[PDB]
RNA sequence: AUAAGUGCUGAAAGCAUCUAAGCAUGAAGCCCCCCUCAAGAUGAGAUUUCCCAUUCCGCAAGGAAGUAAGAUCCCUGAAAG
RNA sequence: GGCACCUCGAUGUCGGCUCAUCGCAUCCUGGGGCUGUAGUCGGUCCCAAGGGUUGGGCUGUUCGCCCAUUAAAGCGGUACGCGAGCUGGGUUCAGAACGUCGUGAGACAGUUCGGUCCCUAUCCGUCGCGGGCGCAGGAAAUUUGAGAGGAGCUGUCCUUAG
């Protein structure tokens, strides 16, 4: 009942590094990535260990202590796996494809409409009716899966538009 | 009986960073120096005060959540319109007028009081126009 | 951008080679010459100053012949400048003549409007005027000042005064038809001053 | 007169406050603001009194 | 979404949160969201 | 750049959480882009060019008296009044 | 409405015309939550004061009802905005009349016909236009832009698409 006390690890090669001023930089397998944090928190990098340890005990220092063990987990996690979220469209004639590294969706909307990642972040189209896509940062790969969301939630009559992973949808009569 | 000095003014050139330094503080005391009242030969209707240049106003900060609270109005007195803008800006563009203003509030008010205000510099960046003037890096006190 | 400095000639109309008939005016524009690039580095900002019409020895001073003496030309009696043009386009002293613009081109016409004289409130602001019957010794007044609380009345309120003569712009209007042998510009419409006044031409912003 | 002598005063590491109080601990300095005026013009003698006023007052 | 000054849990999957200075109710149940003032 | 709204990440408080640390999106609204005025902005700004730094007096504080460039008076007028 | 505090050595009262200008507790337009929201159309609530927010019949009337529209035909403050700006149709004078009360002179928030609306702008203020001076020489032009002002509203139809 303290995630900001557990113990983080380096499994293989995972180069977790200490910048200047709690400042840290991993570049996993899968790429590189970055973080910088406010001073109070002290993480020191150790072999197949990196600590967790905030000065004093109250609300604010308690909140921060937990967010930046949970980010260096994540962002850890990410970089040595890479993360994929998945968006499952519905629709009679909705259509998902490619169009380059561009993105380009088909739905209700009399005129196309596109999309352009440029993060890092991967799109694929494994099938006409589903869209799934790959990155190494879970915050930017969500952001671009709410913002495909974006283009059309579902209604709750019939359901349409595009559908997170096992996203259950409210039901409502259509007389 | 004390001396009413006049035509003996030597006026001082002095230089401050406000870049770590809040403004109501640095307002409040160099408003004070630029009346001239830390001279020990204080008049009050001679403008013994001293010219001073500010450094890095846009670094200025502001305490609590005054950085999107605070208003900065404006009347025109043409019809019921009113401008206004928030501390935060001016940060982006033109922050010698937040000093300006805030220093404008500090002085008497009167003919003098301009002719106080008249005295004060503000500036971006850490470099002066002049440098003739042989100015001298004075730190605040408060 | 791109313009050219002209003085208003007259207005008439021409077939456009369709049956349809189109108003349009007619400016002259000798080649202008550019007399001074404005550039960022000294001045501030990118533009250049350009003269369009030809003065008399006895009425240019020496001022403006020492300042026209760079472009070697003729002083001119109109200069103008334009900004947001190419400063490496143009040479200083080089003529702009008048087929930088074409036919068929969108324009915009900026110039001094037609004086006016002093004038009531109605042919200045155009506000409906009192009853002409029933007694009413109202006639052509220019109505209540406003309410009593303020104690004055307020900024802004429209009174008689003089009228005309203030720079006037007109967007999107379009260039029918040029002849550079005679140095003629034909733009579609109706453009701002009297005639033999002074207009500039621009590209339309938009 | 008081604005004179403070101005005096924290142009030597003290308040016009602690100065007057330092003062009066010191020994009733009779002596007061128009002449420690003159005093401050005369400056070195009003250093002369604004340290043994801080030396007393400690 | 209700703007009631009285906010209260309307049923029991109604949880009570406190956002930006004004407390909410989240509910699965989007009948039931409502904001004070 | 925001309002309401929708959010991604994420603890406080192993969960959950649009939140406290971060990151977004989002109105005929706000600030610009459009048009006009604007250096009396006494903070009187900048650029291009012309005149040159004479004669008199206390020699000098600084005065006066002809001029340089350029204007004015006066006169013919209006596209202005 | 209660009170009588300023004004009875005088502060002009309803409605309309002219001119506006402000608040937002929003009538339309813009952006959203929920809906017993299938869709066109709606109801409720939140943000939103930028702009717009109609012509006639009746009545002195505002207010109302009615006709025809529009996206809508907002509610209020400004001495129930505005008479040294206008109107005088009504209340509020003197004439006369009907009903009623009064023995009577006469009286009616009962009615009806008629019934003098003064002023050369001194100072602020507002809209325009001049002269003087300052801008540590004197001139002729071109300009930066602090900072002000204006606009900033919308329908219908074809297509997408029966």
């Given at each position: ?175 | ?56 106003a846009e670094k200025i900060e502001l305490t609590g959540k005054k950085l999107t609270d605070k208003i900065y109005y ?26 300006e203003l805030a220093i404008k509030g500090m002085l008497p008010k009167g003919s003098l009081g301009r002719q106080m ?26 | ?206 | ?16 406050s602690r100065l007057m109080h330092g003062l009066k601990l010191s020994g009733i300095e009779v002596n007061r603001k ?25 | ?37």
């Amino acid at each position: 009942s303290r995630v900001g006390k557990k113990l983080l690890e380096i499994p293989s090669d995972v180069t977790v590094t200490l910048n200047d001023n709690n400042t840290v930089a991993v570049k996993g397998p899968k790429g590189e990535l970055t973080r910088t944090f406010h001073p109070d928190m002290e993480i020191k990098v150790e072999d197949n260990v990196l600590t967790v340890a905030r000065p004093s005990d109250q609300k604010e220092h308690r909140a921060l202590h937990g967010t930046t063990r949970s980010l260096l987990g994540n962002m850890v996690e990410g970089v040595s796996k890479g993360f994929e979220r998945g968006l499952e469209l519905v629709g009679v004639g909705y259509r998902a494809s490619k169009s380059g590294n561009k993105l380009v969706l088909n739905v209700g909307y009399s005129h196309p409409v596109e999309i352009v990642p440029e993060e890092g972040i991967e799109i694929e189209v494994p099938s006409q009716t589903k869209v799934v896509v790959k990155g190494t940062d879970k915050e930017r790969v969500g952001a671009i899966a709410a913002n495909i969301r974006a283009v059309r939630s579902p209604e709750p009559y019939k359901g349409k538009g595009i559908r997170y992973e096992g996203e259950v949808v409210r039901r409502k009569e259509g007389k | 009986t004390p001396m009413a000095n006049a035509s003996t003014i030597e006026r001082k050139w002095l230089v401050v960073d406000a870049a770590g330094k809040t403004l109501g503080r640095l307002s409040s005391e160099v408003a004070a120096i630029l009346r001239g009242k830390h001279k020990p030969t204080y008049t009050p209707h001679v403008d013994t005060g001293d010219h001073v240049i500010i450094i890095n106003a846009e670094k200025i900060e502001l305490t609590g959540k005054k950085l999107t609270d605070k208003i900065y109005y404006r009347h025109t007195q043409h019809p019921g319109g009113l401008k206004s803008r928030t501390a935060l800006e001016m940060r982006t563009n033109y922050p010698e007028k937040m000093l300006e203003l805030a220093i404008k509030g500090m002085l008497p008010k009167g003919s003098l009081g301009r002719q106080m205000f008249k005295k004060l510099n503000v500036y971006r960046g850490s470099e002066h126009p002049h440098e003739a003037q042989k100015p001298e890096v004075y730190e605040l006190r408060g | 951008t791109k313009g050219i400095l002209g003085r208003k000639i007259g207005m008439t109309q021409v077939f456009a080679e369709n049956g349809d008939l189109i108003p349009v005016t007619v400016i002259e524009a000798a080649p202008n010459v550019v007399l001074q690039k404005k550039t960022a580095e000294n001045d501030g900002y990118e533009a250049i100053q350009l003269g369009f019409d030809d003065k008399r020895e006895k009425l240019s001073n020496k001022p403006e012949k020492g300042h026209v003496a760079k472009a070697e030309t003729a002083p001119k009696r109109f200069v103008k400048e334009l900004r947001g043009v190419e400063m490496d386009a143009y040479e200083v002293g080089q003529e702009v003549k008048v087929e930088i613009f074409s036919a068929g081109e969108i324009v915009d016409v900026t110039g001094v409007s037609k004086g006016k004289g002093f004038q009531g409130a109605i042919k200045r602001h155009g506000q409906s005027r009192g009853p002409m019957s029933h007694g009413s010794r109202y006639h052509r007044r220019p109505g209540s000042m406003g309410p009593v609380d303020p104690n004055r009345v307020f900024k802004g309120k429209l009174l008689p005064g003089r009228m005309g003569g203030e720079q006037i712009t007109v967007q999107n209007l379009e260039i029918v038809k040029v002849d550079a042998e005679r140095n003629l510009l034909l733009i579609k419409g109706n453009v701002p001053g009297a005639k033999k006044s002074l207009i500039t031409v621009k590209s339309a912003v938009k | 007169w008081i604005t004179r002598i403070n101005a005096a005063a924290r142009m030597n590491g003290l308040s016009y406050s602690r100065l007057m109080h330092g003062l009066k601990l010191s020994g009733i300095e009779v002596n007061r603001k128009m002449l420690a005026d003159l005093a401050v013009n005369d400056l070195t003698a009003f250093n002369q009194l604004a340290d043994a006023a801080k030396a007393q007052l400690n | 979404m209700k703007v009631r000054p009285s906010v209260k849990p309307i049923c029991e999957k109604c949880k009570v949160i406190r956002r930006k200075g004004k407390v909410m109710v989240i509910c699965e149940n989007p009948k039931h969201k409502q904001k004070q003032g």
